[model samples]
Structures are given as C-alpha cells and as structure tokens.
Target chain A: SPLHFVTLLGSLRKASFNAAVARALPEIAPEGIAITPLGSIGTFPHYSQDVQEEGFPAPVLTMAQQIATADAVVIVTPEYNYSVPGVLKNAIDWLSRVSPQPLAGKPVALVTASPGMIGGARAQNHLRQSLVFLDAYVLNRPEAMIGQVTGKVDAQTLELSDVATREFLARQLDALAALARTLS
Target chain B: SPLHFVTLLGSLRKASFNAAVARALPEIAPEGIAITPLGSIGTFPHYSQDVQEEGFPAPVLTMAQQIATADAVVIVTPEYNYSVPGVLKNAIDWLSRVSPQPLAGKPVALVTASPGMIGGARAQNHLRQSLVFLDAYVLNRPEAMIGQVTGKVDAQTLELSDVATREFLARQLDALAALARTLS
Candidate 1:
C-alpha cells in the first residue's frame, strides 16, 4: 500500500504562504508517498466539552477520520501572536478529545513559513509542545522553518519559489516517511 | 476617574470555570476599579493578513476600541491541549493588528483555571510570551492559577464558590489595578 500523509494548513488566508507550501507538498513527496490536504478548519466551532458531550461536529469527525487513517501527518502554519494560529490550535483541540485520539502515536512533521526572520519558529515550538501532550511522534530533525517567506513563494501561482526551502521540505518529508515506517 | 478594566474569557463554554471567575471580578475588585467583559471572541473570524489588508472586522474593531479605552486588561483562560485556548488567542491576534496596537504598553493580568492539576499553567506561560511580543506589561506576582476548578464555581449561578480561590483572584485583581495605576 502507498504511504498516505495528511496535511493540515494552519492559516485561513487565501494568500497564505504556509498554504502555498502545503499545496506544494504532494508534488515534492518521495516516490510511493501520497499526500492529501485536509479540508479547511475555519468552519469548525470553538471547542467545548459541552459540545463534545453532545457530539463532535461534522468537520471535526471528518478531519479526525482523515488523520486516523493516514500513515503520517504534516502541519504547515504561520505564527500568530508568537504562537500557533487559533484556527489550527482549535482543530487540534477537537482531535485531542476524540476517543483513540487521531494524532496520538501518529508520525507528524511541522513546517512554518513567515515573512519575519524567525519564520514562525516560536509557533512551531509551541505547536510541538501541544503535539507532545497529544502523544504525537513529531519528526525531530531537518526542521522546515521558511523565513523571508514573502520572497520564497510566487504571488500569482502561490507555489513555493525558493529552491533551498523546497529541498529542505523534501528532506523533512523523507524523514517523516522513515519515522512512520519505523512506528508502523 | 474610575479605573476601567476589560476582561476576556478564553473559553466559550456555557459552564466555563474561567468565565465564572471573570463574572465574579466586579464584586471582588478593589475600590475605583470597574470591570467590563468583552464580547465573545467565538464570533470573531480567524485572523488573516488578507482580511486585515481590506479591513478589520466589526467585532475586532469593537474589541480593539474597548481595549484602547480601558485602563488595563484581564484574561481568564482555560488550557486547550496544554496551551492557551484558540478563541482567546484569536482575539489577541486581531487586537495585535489594530493600528494603535491595543495591547501595547497596556497592563494585563492573567488567570487560568482547570479541573486538572497545574490550573493551565502551561497555557498561562505561553500566553505571557505572546503578550511580551505584543509589548503588554503582564503582572508578575499574585498569579491566579485556579486548579481543581470544577469544584470552585457554582453550576447554577456560574459564580466563583471557593472562598480561598476567590480571595486569590481578588489579590490578582488588586495587583492588576496597582500595575495599571503604575503604568498610568
């Protein structure tokens, strides 16, 4: 069976650099690695235990199922207020509440892109912390923090334009695939 | 003039312990201090630079104005996945973009409550880092991390019920008022 990796884009922006990176992942993956992008998390409601008591929302269930069946996961995000974007965090919160948590024991890789110098590094760290609590096995090396992202992605095409960053992302995916195979 | 403080609750749950703590603030505040609860951040859309380029949404504008006019701010939050709740972080992301930067140079107090031990301490620390980047002066002492919060509030009234915890919250408010006065 082909190795399936599900990707989540943290930003809701139509022109998000992180989204552009996520969009480019399928083309960049190693042979036998298939990438699927999860649906937009912008529609999910603010997570509440009360809501969970009633039932998980349709989007949450849909995304949780996607993650559960995937061989690995990738998160591409931009930092907001020096941390993970709320929309992305909210989606994780929902998945954490699901029985047999979707991200638990899953091999996950993180990528963050920003116009700033740190390339959303703090957000990635914060996200890694959360993923740890969720029992997700995060890829440790070959980090993909794409700084100066404004010049790294095409305005019209929304495709990653920087060769160095593209190579770095491919390496990260290779590591993620290795990790998933080991865990499996 | 009476010192005005605006409080933002991170969780939108109808029975939120953090919300209960926020609701008890007015009566517990020191003399000359008034507390106003900002509207639910759950209604605010996810932050997007694309949307920001066009214009801040109405709720963003309204909350920004409220924060701009207040003497200080209080954030009562619950941890989601070991970090600040997404709804609250979303509000801060919006306020951070306003031209005047509503949180800059503002005195802010943090409080977190959780049924679990640690009382969302990790979330509070992560939130403090974001506030530092925003240039907000967060209170350093008299922290109100209300652990085991499920027993600390009344379900029927949604009011704080534990005397010691209530007192701790009062001290946090008093410290916040002092900090606001010092900044002013």
Candidate 2:
C-alpha cells in the first residue's frame, strides 16, 4: 500500500562519516515516510560462492531480506580512491544475487557525503552505475553531493545543521517515496 | 646462498588458471632456484584492523612472513570488471600496510590471467599504478596478460603452445628473476 524506505551506509568504522550520514537520513526524510538505519555490515563474510551456497551469511541474509521488504533504498558511501569500497561493493554483490531479485526494480536514492568539496561524487557515480546493473530504478532528480557535511553534522545528534543540505536530502527522500508508491 | 622463490597465486578455486600459471614458475626458475607456490589467499582473514588488533591474523602473519622472507613475490590474479578482484585487492592492502615496509621496495611481479581476451590487462595495469603509489618496485616491463589463458594453457601442464604468448611470458619471467635477485 505505502512505501517503506531504508538507508544503508557503506563504511563500518565507528566514527565513519558515511554511517553518520545514514543516521541523518531519518531526521531529513519526508514526513510519514519510513526510514530505517542499518545494523551491521562488518559481520558480513568474505563472499565466496561456496559459503553463499552453504547459505547466505547472517548479515547478508538480513540485508537482502531488508531490501526485499522495502519499497525504496538509499545508499550513502565514501569514495575510496575514486571508487566504492570493496566491502560495500561485496555486500551489494551478495544481496543482489538473492533469488526473486531482492534488489531488482527497487527504487534507489543516492547521496554521497564527504569532507572534500567534491562531495565524494566519484563514489556516488560509481554506486549508481552498479545499481543500474542490478536493475534498480534510480531517482534522477534532486541529486546530492553533501560536501563538508562532516563539519555540519553533530556527533551526538547526527543531524544536519546545514539548512540547504537538509532540504536537498528531504527532497530526495520525497522523490524516493513518490517513486516507490507509483512504480508498483 | 642464493634465494629461492615462491610464486603466489591469488585465488583458491580448485580449477584456478592463475594457480596453474604459478605452477609454471618452478619449471622456468633459474637453476638452484626453488619455487614454492602459495596456493590459497584464504589463509589470511579478510583483513580486519579489528581482528588484527595487536597483530596480523595468524594466517596473515604467516603470509607476510613469506613475503618478507622471499627474494621476490609473484602474484597471479584475475581481473574483475577491468580491475583487480576484491579479495586480491584486500590482500594487497594488508601487505602494503605492514610497517618498516610491508611490501616496500620488495621486488614484485604481477600477472593478471583470465578467460577474457585481454586477460584482464586493465586490471593488471590498474594494479601497477596502485603498486607505484605503495612504493613497491613493480616491474614496468610490459604486462603478462594471459589472454584467453583459461583455455590457452593446459590445466595440468601449465604449458602454453601459443608461440607469441609463450615468448612474452618467458621474457617477463626472465625480467622478474633478474629483479628478484637485485632486491635481496
């Protein structure tokens, strides 16, 4: 009936800015929209076909199931040398391979947050390219590169103090919500 | 006493063609040079600064010791999507992080083999650029891209009847052996 949105950030570091931006998602998501934060990607195993056949590792199963139930997904990431981190890419490889296409046709919102002025856009671009291969429907409007978000977000609240940044993210969430409901 | 060499193959799939090429090392190695192949990279954990706290994972420690003790190291890898595979890159990351020089100035030979026509040469070139940044003395002699190597070499023999390919590989190995002796 309605859209449910979930956000996953790529990094597992305790003080990661990517994870921080994921935390900021709930606060900026449009009202009445569902927003859930991630639990753990670190626990996901070193992906192997053998291990995958033995069964999806717990974190991978949990992530795939999350995507299966969600109407929209948002990925927040940091660019490591102009590409997505291996761990995050590995997670996508695992979750998208799940049967019945856990991620296929899922509406996706992409936002890259970084201390650099370029907003980690290289990684954001790379992330979108992979989503296309996985057959995810990406929201084209309201693209965001949250440059210097680290300086604006509070450690305790993980809330965006940057007014323009919040509005940009909120609109993206709205676009995702709208797409999620109509696509079905 | 002269140094013996170890040719390390980066993957563990039992039918791995890269390993097959590594197997060729012993045959071509100079007289009195023994080549021990390090078969599986899985011996090292998917590098976690978390798990490696206070020390490398036991298997990683052992591999690093192999790298440290060896006169030179040969890495045969498969390129994924015009780049190195995630797990192989992970191993390089771990090896490069070792202090007092993990792989610093350690003589190294890189070869990317594949079923694809380019034999993942793009990935091997990409790695050359990466190794340059890490300050490893990478062999700049043209890449040993085993184009269609998965089919070109007999699985058991590690022998290539492909004339030009054989010549290229023989020359590359000769250069590598020369560089190896210089390192120690």
Candidate 3:
C-alpha cells in the first residue's frame, strides 16, 4: 500500500519561494509515498456560513476531497505579520466546515520559509495551534523552518538551491510520511 | 481633541457577536474618544506588494489614514481554528504595508467573543503577537474575552447584554484610552 499526502502552500505568487518548495517535495519524497499538491485554494471565496448553507463551493469541495483521500497533509506557509497569511488560514477555515471533516485525526506536517532569520517560525506556531483545534496531529520535531530563504531560493529558477535546506526538507518529509503510516 | 480610535472587527458577519461588542464599545466609552469602524475590510483584495507598488487601493489608503490619525486601535475578533479570523488578519497586513506604518507605536486593546468557553482566548494570544510584530503595544490587563456569548449577546438587539461584560469592556476601553493619551 502506498502512502498518499496532500500539500497546501500558503503563498500564491508566481515566484513564491513556498511554491518552489512544494515543487521540490516530490524529489525528496521516499519511494511509495505519493505527494499531491492542493491548488487554487487562494481562489476560494471567503468562508461564509451563508455559502455553506447554500452548499460548499466547488473549489472548497475539491480541496476537502483531496485531504479526505490523503493519508496525511503537509502545509508549507510563509509568515505574514508574525502569523500565517490570511489566504492560507481562510482556506483552512473553509476546510474545517465541510462535511466528513477530513482533518480530524489526520497526520500533518508543517514547514515555513521566510526572507527573515526567524524563518516564519511564529507563523508556524499559529498554524500548529490551529491544527490542534482542528483535531490534527502535527509532527513536532525536525521542523523545516527555512530562514534566509531569499538567498537559498533561486528567483529565476524557482528552485530550492541550498543543499542544507534540501537535506532538512527531505528529513521532514520522511518523518511526516512515517507518522502518516503510524496514524493510518 | 477627542481621542480617535480605529476599530477592526475580526468577523464580517451581519450579526457577528464580536461586532456586537464593537457596537457596544462607544456607549461605554468615556468622553473624548471617537471610535471609527473599518467598514468593508472583508471586501479588500488579497494583499500583494505589487498592488502597493502601483499605489494603495482606495480602501487601503482610507483605512491607513484612519489609523494614522488615531490615538489608539481596538480589535474585536472571533476565534477561528484557534486564531484570528483571516479577513481581519488580511486587513492588518494591508495596514502594515501603507506608508508611515500607522500601527507603529499605537496602543491597542484586544477583545474576543465566542460561543465557547475560551472566548477566543487563543485568537487573542495570536493577535497580540501579531500586533507586537507590527510595532504596536497591547494593554495587558482587563482582557475582555466574552465567552459563551450566545447567551450574553442579544440576538435581535445585536447588543452585548451581559452586565459583567459591559463592566469589563468599559475598563478595557479606559485602559486603552489612557494608554492612547499617554502615547499621544
């Protein structure tokens, strides 16, 4: 049986370093682990009870299905004002509402990249706490908090170029994959 | 001159309990404080540095000016996934970018209301840290976390009905107003 994981990226910019990290994940994933990236999450309308009353929007339903089908979830985010960006959090809010509540008991991995030294560590703190409320288990150690990302992420290439960061990321994926197996 | 305060509500619901608290504040406010709500913040576009390079959109600039002239700010938020609502955080990010950084050195009071017992306490914790990163000072004591707000806030009136909540909110406003006066 293969392990399946769904990924959520916090940033939507075409050149976002976080996006590059998402692109880089497959190469690092161990054999037998399938990585699926959730896209167009930023396009989902704001979370609204009114909309939910009407019905879950198509994109929201699509992402929820991805999470439900996956054995685990990985969220790669950027820090904004010492917290996760609103767009990312908004997407999570939408996910929390849909039927079947996919995230409960789900094994999740947290990664953050920032142009600053703290590596969006504060943002990860909030995201971790949010997941706790959502009933998701977060793999705590070996956090892939990549600081000084501007130097490591090649803007033109949209690739993670730093060898050390790549190694840490590989280890993080391995840990998350193992945790997913245990939880499943 | 009347003390001017910018109020940011974390929820955009027509009958949000947090918004009920926002509406109740002025009645409890002592003489000489003018609180202005940042309307339509939920409708603001997703934040982009590129958007700012062209020039702040009208609403962003409008809110920026409101903060720039204010002696203090008050944020009333609901707990969502154990953090501040994304729309509110999004608005703060937009405020963080505008020129003069109006939040720098500003005094702030945080208020949270929830149907649950924690009363959005975790959200306040994250919001406090976010304000710190924005160079704002948060009043430490007399936190006005209104828990189990379904009973305390009048559904039809859309007013905070709890007498104890009224007292605490008054005190919170006083502390924020005093801090604002000193900062001014």
Candidate 4:
C-alpha cells in the first residue's frame, strides 16, 4: 500500500488555515501517497451511551470506516485556549468507544497551524496524549507547529505558501509514509 | 438589581456531568445570586466574519441579549483529552465576534469535573487563557479541579455529594459573588 492517509481538522470555519494546510497535503506528499480529508468531520453527535444504543450516526460510521481502511492519520488543528478545540475532541470521543479500535495501531501525523505565537504547541501535546490513549503511533520528529500561519497562507484560496512550512510538512508526510509501511 | 450569573457548559449529553454541575449552582449560591443556563447554548452556527455582515443569527442574538445583562458567568467543563470540548469553544467563537463586548469586564468562575485523575486541570488553564483574552475578570483562588469525579457525584441524580467538593465549590461561588459585587 502507498499509504492512504485520512485527515481530521479541528476548525469549522470555511476559511480556516488548518483546513487550508490539509488541502495542501497531497501536493507535498511523496509519490504514490494519497491524502483525503475526513468527509463531514464536524458532524458527529456528542458521545453518549444512549446514542450508542440507537446505533452510530451515519457521519460517525462513515468516519470509522474511513479510519479502518486508512494507513495513517493527520490531525490539523488550531489551539483554542492553548489546547485542542472541543469539536475535534468530540469526534475522538465518539470514535474511541467503538469496538475493534479503528484508531489503534495507526500512525498519526500532527500539524498545528495557528495565528498565535505558540502555533498550537499546547494543543499538539494534548492531542498526542489522546492518541496515546487511543493506542495510536505518531511520528515524533519533524513536528509541524505552524505559527503566525494566517500571514503565510492565502486566505482566499486556502493555499499554504510558506517555504519553511511546506518543507517541514513534506518531511512529515514522508515520515508518515515510512511509518505506515512499517506497520503494514 | 441583584447580580446575575449565566452558565455555559461544554457538553451536550442529556446526562452530562457538566450540566449537572451547572444545575447545582443556584442551590449552593448565596442570596441575591441569580443563575441561569444559556438557552439552547449548543445551537449556534459556526462563527464567521462573513456572517456578521448579514447580522447575528437569532440564537446568537438571543445569547448576546442574555450576556448583555449578566454581571458574571460560570463555565463548567470536562477535559476531553486534556482540554475543553469543541462544543464550548464553538460557542465562544460565535460570542467573541459580537459587538459591545458581551463578556468584557464580566466576572467568571471556572469549574472542571472529570472522571480522570487530573480533573481537567489543563483544560481549566486553557479556558482561563481565553477568558483573559475576552477581558473577563476571573476569581484567582479556590480553583475547582474536581478529579476522580465519577464517584463524588451520583450518576442518576447528578447531585454532587462529596463534602470536600461542595466546600470548595461554595468558596469558589462566594469569590465570584464578591468579584461581581465589586464590579457593580
């Protein structure tokens, strides 16, 4: 397999820089590596046992199935209050309770693109903590903490043009590819 | 007029402990401390500057109206992966972009109830950072970091029965009252 990667973005804004970065992933990824955004990522209902009995929501079922087939995952996020946004956590909570562990043993690449000075560093740390709990592996080196990102990204087209960001992101993708290969 | 307190919770479940904690606020508060939850707080659309030109949505307008008159606020949350849930952050993004600063100068009390051992300590820190950015004055002492919380409150009744938790929460509320009084 050439590593089919699924991306989960935390922001709901149509003009979000994190989503912009996700859109750019395919361009920078190595040859044969494929990247796709989680369709309707924000559509999961809050995690509840009551809701569980009714069966997983259609959006959630779609997401789980996507993760089950993917070789690696990338989470693009912005730090809210120095942590990962609650919207993203909501999705993770719903996915975590499902059987057979769709996320378990998967390789993860984390990218935090924020307008703040910290570039969502705290969020990456907290998000990695959750990945550990989910039993997922993550690429340690070449971490993508893109700070002051609004200036580097094109707002109208949602394109990331920063050379440094692109360079690191490309390397991160390569690492993810290798990690996925190791798992396979 | 007596000091009014509006509550915002981070979860949307029928049995969310954060909501349970919010319901408990009135009973533990002193005389003249009025408390109410944000009406249908989870229903606001994703915030966008573009939408601002069309005028705030009815739900947003309704929320702003309530915040406009409140003297203080309380945010009860659970740490999902060491941070606040996206549902709460989503509401804040909508509220923050509105005019006349609905949250500006209002006193805030933060309480985190978690089943985990850390008790959402990190989420509280992150949330306080956002409140500070919103220019909301917060009570600095007696932080309510309720850890191992599943045992402290009754699952069915949602009543916080732990004596220590109650005592700490009482002090926290008193501090919020004093802060609101000072502001008034």
Candidate 5:
C-alpha cells in the first residue's frame, strides 16, 4: 500500500523559508505517494473552549480529518527568534485537543529551515517534546537539521536547494516514507 | 528597594491550586515590598506576531511594565500531565517576546503546586529550560515545588497553607528582592 503523506507548512509569511521547504515536498517525496498540502494555519484561532464546545473549527477539523485519513504527517517550521513559533504551536494545540483529534498514534516527521548555524534545532526539540504527549510516532532520522537555507531557495521553482541539500532532503524523504509504511 | 511581587496564576479554573497559593501573597510578603496578585491569565489572547504587530495588548504591556519597573517576578504554575498547563506557557510566551520584553534580566522564582506526587517537579524542570531564553535570573535557593496542595488551601479564602507554603514562598520573595538589589 502506498503511503499518502500530508504536509503542513507552518509559516504565514509570503517569503518564509519554512513554507518554501513545504512547497518543495513533491520534488523529494517517493514515487506513488500522494503528498497533499493543507490550508493556512494562520486562519485557525487560538484554542478557545468556546470554539471546542461545538467542535473544532472547520479548518482545524478538516486538518485533523485529513490527518486521520492519511498515513503520516510532515510538519515544517521556522524558528521565531528562538524556540517555537506561535502560529505553529497554536495549530498543534488545536489538533491535539480531545475527540476526533489528529494526535493519536499518528506517524509524523519534523523538518526545519533557518539561516542560522544551528538551523532550527530549538524549535524541533520543542516539537519533539509536544509530539511525545500527543502519542505520535516521530522519525529520528537525519540526526540534525537543514541549515543555511538563505541561498538555497531556487529562483526558478521558488523552493530550496543548490545541490547537496537536494540530495540529503531526497534521502530523508525516502527514509520517512519507509518508516511511515511500517507504522501504517 | 524592596521587590514588588506579581503572582501570575496560570490556571483559568476557579478552584486552581496555584491560584489558591497566589491568594496568600499579601500575608507572607516582606515589609516595605508590595505584594500584588495577577490572578487571571485567561484575560490573555493567544499570542500572535500579527497581534504583536498592532501593538502590545494592555495586559502584555502592563505586565512588561510591571517587570521593568519592579525588581523581580515570581512565577507560580501547576503541572498538568507532567508539564506546566498550556495557559501558563502562553503567558510566559507573551512576556518573553523580543524588544522591551519583561523577561530579560528580571529575577524569577518558580513555584509549583499540585495534588499528585513529584510536587510538580517535572513541570518545574521544564520551566527552567524556558526561563533560560527569558533571560530572567532564576533563583537557585530553597528549590520549591509544593505537592498535595489540596491539603493546603483554606475553604473560606481559598488561600494556601501560610505556615508551610507561604514560608517557602517567602524565601523566594526574599531571594528575589536580594537579587534585584544585587543586580541593580
């Protein structure tokens, strides 16, 4: 069975590097796997009990529904100053809420993009902690992060990679797909 | 100058244990220092860069002003599933934002309350990691986390055990004031 991957881009900025990485997913995703992009996380409100009283908002419910139907999820985020971005954390909080949530035993992969030397490890470390309580199975591969992403964005595709980064990303995508297959 | 203390109770629940502990601040505070209650975090919205763009909200700027004008800040949080409640993190996140933020160099003491064992220590440890980025001077002394808070709160005032809990909280208050003097 082919793995259907759902990728969530966690930045709302038009020129965000994280979104650029998500935009490039199809280039690295394995053959026969359908990689679907979800809607804007920016549109989702901060988790309010009032909204959850009825049910998750339409965008949030749709995200969880798509995730529940999919084999795995990919979250790509940027470091805002340091640690996790508010928009990214808000989406995770929304999805991890009780009942019809996207969190339960979900297979997930995390990727980060930044111009700094440490890449976005701080944000990824925080994400790793969050996915823990959510009961999601996360990939531990590639060992580090994707750094120096400033010049990597291609003018032609408006995505990432000058060459080496492309190969490494392709390898990790294969590894994630293989892991997702077993978990599925 | 005696340090003015503001207790940011992290829970929205009416009967929150940390809130009960915070209610006792006025009694145990040292003479010459003002002890104040910042009873509700529910008044805060989900922190967003979009929101910050418009200008800091009244509560945020007010709290930032409090941190800047004052000598130290004491954070009282309750553990939820081995971590500080989401609302606590939201308040910390709001205060820790860059530029004129309240967290930098301001001495902070972490006090945890819980009904279960471990005294909410897990959440305390996690908060220590976050406090690093806050740049707040965290107190090392009388390392406090009070477990079984149910036994401490008074039925009438909803106050904590002034004898035991306030004593421990008082130690932090003294330390924070001393730290402010030292840093100043």
Candidate 6:
C-alpha cells in the first residue's frame, strides 16, 4: 500500500509560494508515497475554551480525523511577522485539543518559503516548538526553507519552478516517508 | 491629556485568565494613564493578500485607527501550544498590512497568563519578535508573565488576587507609560 501523507499549507493567499510548494509536493514525492492536501483552514473559528465547551466545530473534527488517519503530516507555511501564520497556528490549537491529539507520535515535516532572506526559518522554529509540545516527530534534516521565493516560483502557474528547490523538497519528502515508516 | 493605551487580549474565552488580567490592568495602571480594551478579533477574517486586494475589512480599519490614535499598546494573552494564540497573531497580521503599520514605533507591553509553568513566556518571546519586525518598541523590563495563574486569579471576580502579581502588573504598566512618554 502507498504511504499516505497529508499536507497543510499555512498561507491563505491564492498565490502563496508556500501553497505552490504544497501543490508541488505530490509530484516530487518518491514512488509508492501519496500526498493529500488538507482543506483551507481559513474558516476555522478563533479557538476558545468556551466555544469548545459546547462542542468541537465541524472543521476541527474533520481535520483531526484526516491527520489521525494519515501516515505523516507536512506543513508548508510562510512567516507572518517573523512567526507562524495565525490561521495555521489556530488550526493546530484546535487539533491539539481534540482526543488522541492527532499530531502526537505522528511523523511531520516542515517547509517554509518567503521572499525574505531567512526563508521563514524563524516561523519554522517557532512551529517546531509548538509541535514539540504536541509530541509530533518532526523531520530535522534536509530542511526545505525556500527563501527568495519570488525568483523560484512561477507567478502564472503558481508552481515551484526551481530545480534545486524541487530536489530539496523531494529529499525532504523522502526523509518524511522514512520517518513515518520508522514510527509506524 | 491622558496617556491612552489600547489593550488587545489574545484569548476570547469567557473565563480566560489573560482576559481577566486585561480587565484588571486599567485599575492597576498609574494615574494619567488610560487603557481601553479593543474589540474582539474573532470577527477579523483570516488574513490574505487577496482579501486585502479588495479592501481592508471594517474590523481591521477600526483596529488600525484605534492603535494609530493610542499612545501605546498592551497585549494580554495566553499561550496556545507554547506560542502566541492564533487570534492575536491574526489580528497583528491584519494590523501589519494596514497603512502606517499601526504598531510602527509604538510602545507596547505584553502580559501572558497560563495555568502551566513558564507563564506563556515562550509566546511572549515570539510576540516580541513580531513586534520588533513591526518596529514597535516593546517594554524591556518588569516582565509580567503570570504563571500558575490558577492560584493568583479569582474565579468569581475574574481578577488578579495576588498582591505580588498586582504589584508586578502595576510596575509593568508604569514602565509601559514611561516608555510611551519617552518616545512621545
């Protein structure tokens, strides 16, 4: 059976370079691995204990199930103000609160892209800290921090156009699959 | 004129300790300093370049104006998954996109309360980085991270009940005002 992975893009922008990377992942994945992109988190309500008291929102439940069943998770995101995008963090907050804690013990990989020099690296570090709290097994090597994304991503197709970046992403995906297999 | 400051609470929970701290701040503040709590960021849409292409949302514009007119800013928030809550970051994302970048050159102070140890300190650090990127002058000392807040805050009153914590908050507020004055 193919190794199934779920990808979550942190940026909601229609032309997000991070989203382009996410869209390019399936084609870059090693043979026998399948990637599925999760639905946009733009609609998730602001997380609140009071709101959770009533019941888990439909989106939260759906995401939880998707992550729970996936062999691994991939997060491709952009930095907003030097940290993880709020919508992405908000989605994690919801997933973390649900039973079984979908991310716990799960293999996860991070890829951050930005036009800035550091390639959203700070945001990835902050996100890694959050994933640590959730006990997610994050891939640490072959990092896919694509900086100066303007030159690497095609504006019209909204796809990754750089060969070096695609190779790095492929290596990261291969590592992610290996990690998932080890944990599984 | 009073040194006016706008407070943005990160959590929207009805009984959030962070919100309780926000509620208690105005009273704890020194004479000649006034604090106004900003409206909830819950209604603010998930930020996107596409959304901004249309026009800034009413909530974003309203918040920008409030921050623009204020002498300083205060953030009372909780750590979600060991970092700044999504709603707060989302609000900042919106505020960062607006004209003049409301937080630019503004004096800001952060207060985080949590039941867990570390007192949302990690979240504060990450938020400070964001503020730095926004060119906001964050207060450096009299840090007000209220850890183990379960014992320090009153459930019924929903207010800070610890004298030491109150003093700490007061000193922070005073320092915030002083910082604002120096910049003004």
Could you say which candidate leads in TM-score? 1
Superior by DockQ: candidate 1 or candidate 6: 6
Q: Give the clashing pairs for model 2.
A: none
The segments of candidate 4 whose C-alpha lies over 4 angstroms from its true place after superposition are: A46-49, A114-118, A147-165, A182-184, B47-54, B115-117, B147-167, B182-184
lDDT (0-100) at residue A122 of candidate 3? 85
Q: What is the TM-score of chain A alone in each candidate?
A: 0.97, 0.92, 0.96, 0.95, 0.93, 0.97
Worst window of 10 by summed lDDT in candidate 6 chain B: B153-162
What are the models' TM-scores? 0.97, 0.75, 0.95, 0.84, 0.83, 0.96
Question: For residue B120, what is the lDDT in candidate 2?
Answer: 71
Query: Of the candidates numbered 2 and 3, which has the greater DockQ value?
Result: 3
Mark the regions of model 1 whose C-alpha exceeds 4 Å error after superposition: none
The lDDT, on a scale of 0 to 1, for candidate 2 is 0.71
Model 2 chain B — which ten-residue stretch has the worst lDDT? Answer: B43-52
Deviating ranges (above 4 Å) for candidate 3: none
Clashes (N, CA, C under 3 Å) per candidate:
0, 0, 0, 3, 0, 0
lDDT tens digits, residues B1-184, model 2?
4666666666655566776777666765656566687636665555444554657666566677877777777788776544556566666656655665557777778887788787776667656665676677888786687877756677666565455665676577677778876765
Which 10-residue span in candidate 5 chain A carries the lowest summed lDDT?
Answer: A79-88
Question: What level of docking quality does candidate 1 show?
Answer: medium
Question: Which pairs in model 5 have colliding backbones?
Answer: none
**Which of the two, 3 or 5, has more TM-score?**
3
lDDT per residue, candidate 6, A1-184, as tens digits? 6899999989887888888999999999889899999988986888888899999999899989999999999999998888998888999998999998899999999999988788878888999999999999999998878889999998888889999999888888888888888888
RMSD of 1: 1.3
Candidate number achieving the greatest DockQ relative to the actual structure = 6
Locate the minimum summed-lDDT window of 10 residues in model 5 chain B. B79-88
Instruction: Give the C-alpha interface root-mean-square deviation per candidate.
Output: 1.2, 3.2, 1.3, 3.1, 3.8, 0.8
What lDDT tens digits, residue by residue, belong to model 6 across residues B1-184? 5799899989888888888889888888889988889989888988889999999999899989999999999999998888998888999999999988899999999999989889988999999999999999999998888889999988888877888888888899889988988888
